[PDB]
Amino acid sequence: VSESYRRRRQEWELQYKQAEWEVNSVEQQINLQNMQIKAANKRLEQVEA
Amino acid sequence: QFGSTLLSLLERKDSLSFDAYQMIQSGDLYRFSIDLQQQDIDINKASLE
């Protein structure tokens, strides 16, 4: 029975590691849209000018 | 002859000066719109980054 502990442990441990890289990943959308919003805001220059 | 002359040439000045203002003043467009590519390049770079 002593191995059952390690077995149950490891899937949770790896899922936490999964969450780690996933949170690393999602930063992309934040900076992508930061660029999008600022550029689009500047784009109004062409119209108003 | 004076009348006709001045008329024609002044109308020339007018027309050319219209397009003159248009061309000289609106020519700022490319510098103004440099960001169009100058930041979308970073947009695409950030993807793989």
Curated annotation (Swiss-Prot), chain A:
The isolated toxin complex includes 3 peptides starting between residues 768 and 778 of this protein, which might be physiologically relevant. It is found in: Secreted. Residues 2-49 form a coiled coil. Disruption phenotype: Cells with a disrupted yenA1-yenA2-chi2-yenB-yenC1-yenC2 locus are no longer pathogenic in C.zealandica larvae. Semipurified toxin complex consists of at least YenA1-YenA2-YenB-YenC1-YenC2-Chi1-Chi2. The Yen-TC:K9 subcomplex is about 26 nm tall and 22 nm in diameter with 5-fold symmetry and 5 copies of YenA1, YenA2, Chi1 and Chi2; the chitinase subunits may be solvent accessible on the exterior the complex. The Yen-TC:K9 subcomplex has no insecticidal activity. The native complex with additional YenB, YenC1 and YenC2 subunits is 16 nm taller and is insecticidal; the toxicity-conferring subunits are present at about 1 copy each. Part of an orally active toxin complex (TC) with strong insecticidal effects on larvae of the Coleoptera Costelytra zealandica, Acrossidius tasmania and Adoryphorus couloni and some Lepidoptera larvae. The TC has an endochitinase activity. This is Toxin subunit YenA2. It comes from Yersinia entomophaga. The chain holds residues 1024 to 1072 of 1364 of the full protein.
Curated annotation (Swiss-Prot), chain B:
Semipurified toxin complex consists of at least YenA1-YenA2-YenB-YenC1-YenC2-Chi1-Chi2. The Yen-TC:K9 subcomplex is about 26 nm tall and 22 nm in diameter with 5-fold symmetry and 5 copies of YenA1, YenA2, Chi1 and Chi2; the chitinase subunits may be solvent accessible on the exterior the complex. The Yen-TC:K9 subcomplex has no insecticidal activity. The native complex with additional YenB, YenC1 and YenC2 subunits is 16 nm taller and is insecticidal; the toxicity-conferring subunits are present at about 1 copy each. The isolated toxin complex includes 3 peptides starting between residues 768 and 778 of this protein, which might be physiologically relevant. This is Toxin subunit YenA2. It is found in: Secreted. The gene is yenA2. It comes from Yersinia entomophaga. The chain holds residues 878 to 926 of 1364 of the full protein. Part of an orally active toxin complex (TC) with strong insecticidal effects on larvae of the Coleoptera Costelytra zealandica, Acrossidius tasmania and Adoryphorus couloni and some Lepidoptera larvae. The TC has an endochitinase activity. Disruption phenotype: Cells with a disrupted yenA1-yenA2-chi2-yenB-yenC1-yenC2 locus are no longer pathogenic in C.zealandica larvae.
